[PDB]
Amino acid sequence: KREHWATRLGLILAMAGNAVGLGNFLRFPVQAAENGGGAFMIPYIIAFLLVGIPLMWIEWAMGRYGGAQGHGTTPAIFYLLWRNRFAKILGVFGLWIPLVVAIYYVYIESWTLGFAIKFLVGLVPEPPATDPDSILRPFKEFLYSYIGVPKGDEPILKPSLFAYIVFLITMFINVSILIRGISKGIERFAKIAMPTLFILAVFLVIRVFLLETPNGTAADGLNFLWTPDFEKLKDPGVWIAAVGQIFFTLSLGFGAIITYASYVRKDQDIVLSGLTAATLNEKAEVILGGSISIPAAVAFFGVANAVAIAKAGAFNLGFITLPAIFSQTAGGTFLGFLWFFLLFFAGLTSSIAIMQPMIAFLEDELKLSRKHAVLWTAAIVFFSAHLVMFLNKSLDEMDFWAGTIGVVFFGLTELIIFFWIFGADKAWEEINRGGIIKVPRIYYYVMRYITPAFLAVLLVVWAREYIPKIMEETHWTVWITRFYIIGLFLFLTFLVFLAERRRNHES
Ligand SMILES: CCCCCCCCO[C@@H]1O[C@H](CO)[C@@H](O)[C@H](O)[C@H]1O
Ligand SMILES: CCCCCCCCO[C@@H]1O[C@H](CO)[C@@H](O)[C@H](O)[C@H]1O
Ligand SMILES: CCCCCCCCO[C@@H]1O[C@H](CO)[C@@H](O)[C@H](O)[C@H]1O
Ligand SMILES: CCCCCCCCO[C@@H]1O[C@H](CO)[C@@H](O)[C@H](O)[C@H]1O
């Protein structure tokens, strides 16, 4: 009846693949540097222990629970968990979030593929020594020419022809994997991509470790992230930043886990498999990820400038700073190729995970073939992405409502539906059923009180500090993007309507 993962190992590597592309290498280093890396470890571990693990297991169980009844998607899974019309409209969010994220994410993934192509061939800017900004500016210009950034006032992006071609290639590659299916495509690619990612990261970590400059060494930069500033541990903002990173550490709230877990067999383990996968992502995020960006930056610019450059963001550190830092070292363009090849493969395992929920919806509810479901989903993403490519703050706008506010809000709804409405006793049985290991009794208290309290705190905080703080100082072109992604929610709600009408006719 339903597709299933062939092997336990490929399932875990596939699941681990979702979180890797969502800034695993870039986000964690920045959050630690802003909040004191050594000090930041304790909040990060508490959040991973009291938020990430419980929610991951909740998502795994909801996916597998729905997959037994033939549904991999939250409109139907919520309705099975909660027999109410409002659960179906709430489930639309769980389709909407991964779809909106995909609209701009695959485009960003294309940037790594294009940059990797340009670096491999050596078609990169070369700074002439040494001025911190004069090294950074020619690469900042390089990204802007690729994206088509205007002067600054204009809201129009003029993407390069090369960047458009690469976006098509990137989309075609996504389709090649997704069209093969769960085991022939996703699972086969994850068994190839994850080890390749591991070798590049380790290779990069060793290479970065050997970087030295009169401004500093890379070993000094590594020491900045493990020596604690215990005085910064008392700040509530560090705890707010720790919980938020965990969502990107494990790709919680994007719907990828649920849809993936729907192809887990009804009696297969989710307790050990999900715990292993979440451990893989955390180890890769801390060890491998938190050892390439910051240490290389500290070596070239010293500790002080590095924090000022780490405050420029995780994206400014990934496409401008690190390529400019590798630009000066021996074999540096090839190291930039490796860095960008790493990002692309990490993106590939993630872009296929957030496009699979829409593919599952068409198959499960509208009864489309995999071929048609993959192509139609590809068409919708490719078409909608023209908004992200040509409208200036459009990417930023989708990232906020879907990938920032949306995922955290949806994570709380998953908890309440499964553990409060569906029943905490029922949900506990569903989680631990078929488990190689069993969840400890303490997590029943955590999943029912601690985890929802932490999320509601993060939300109300992330709300008041982001949502209504500045609703008036955004340019008027943001309404274009808001109008479109609101139309997408109406489109999905109509499809859920059609799906019920066909299900009321198949009787
Ligand atoms: C395959 C479907 C094509 C849809 C066309 C989208 C609008 C065209 O897009 C433009 O194409 C030009 C070259 O063709 C590029 O130079 C421009 O960068 C790009 O903006
Ligand atoms: C692996 C393939 C990567 C994409 C290669 C296509 C690069 C498109 O690049 C374009 O090619 C044109 C020539 O036809 C030139 O006139 C344009 O200046 C150039 O931007
Ligand atoms: C595509 C047509 C959209 C029309 C835009 C809505 C009317 C303009 O609304 C604008 O919204 C901004 C929100 O940040 C405010 O800062 C501006 O003051 C306001 O003029
Ligand atoms: C913001 C919440 C409102 C978004 C638009 C929902 C209004 C449409 O209502 C929809 O009608 C359908 C009838 O079958 C039902 O399947 C859906 O559950 C219901 O949400």
Residue numbers in the entry: 4 to 131, 134 to 512
Article, verbatim:
Neurotransmitter:sodium symporters (NSS) terminate the signal transmission in brain by active reuptake of neurotransmitters from the synaptic cleft through a Na+-dependent mechanism. To address this fundamental aspect of NSS function we purified LeuT in a Na+- and substrate-free state. Importantly, the structures show that an invariant Leu25 of the unwound region of TM1 is rotated and positioned into the substrate-binding pocket, while Glu290 remains occluded from the extracellular environment, presumably in a protonated state. The structures pinpoint Leu25 of LeuT—a completely conserved residue in the NSS family—as a key residue for stabilization of the empty substrate and Na+ sites associated with the inward-to-outward conformational transition.
We obtained two crystal forms, which however display a closely related crystal packing that is also recurrent in other LeuT structures: a C2 form with one LeuT molecule in the asymmetric unit determined at 3.1 Å maximum resolution, and a P21 form with two molecules and determined at 2.5 Å resolution. The lower-resolution C2 form structure was obtained at pH 5.0 and overlays well with molecule B in the higher resolution P21 form obtained at pH 6.5, for which the molecule A is slightly more open. Therefore, the P21 form is the main subject for further analysis as it shows both representations of the same functional state and is determined at a higher resolution. Thus, the extracellular cavity is exposed, and variations in the degree of opening (comparing molecules A and B) correlate with how n-octyl-β-D-glucoside (OG) molecules bind in that cavity at the Arg30-Asp404 gate, similar to the outward-oriented, Na+/substrate-occluded state20. At the unwound part between TM1a and TM1b, we observe a key difference to the Na+-bound forms at the substrate-binding site: Leu25, which is conserved in all NSS, has rotated due to a neighbouring flip at the polypeptide chain, and it now directs the side chain into the vacant S1 substrate-binding site. The Asn27 and Thr254 side chains both interact with Na+ at Na1 in Na+-bound forms, but now interact with the buried Glu290 side chain (molecule A). The Asn27 side chain shows variation in the two molecules in the asymmetric unit. In a slightly more open molecule A conformation Asn27 adopts a similar rotamer as in the Na+-bound states; however, interacting directly with Glu290 side chain. In a more closed molecule B (similar to the C2 form at pH 5), Asn27 is moved away from Glu290 and interacts with the backbone of Ala289 and Asn286 on TM7. However, we observe residual density in molecule A that superimposes with the molecule B rotamer of Asn27 and a water molecule, thus indicating flexibility of the structure in this region as also noted by relatively high B-factors (see above).
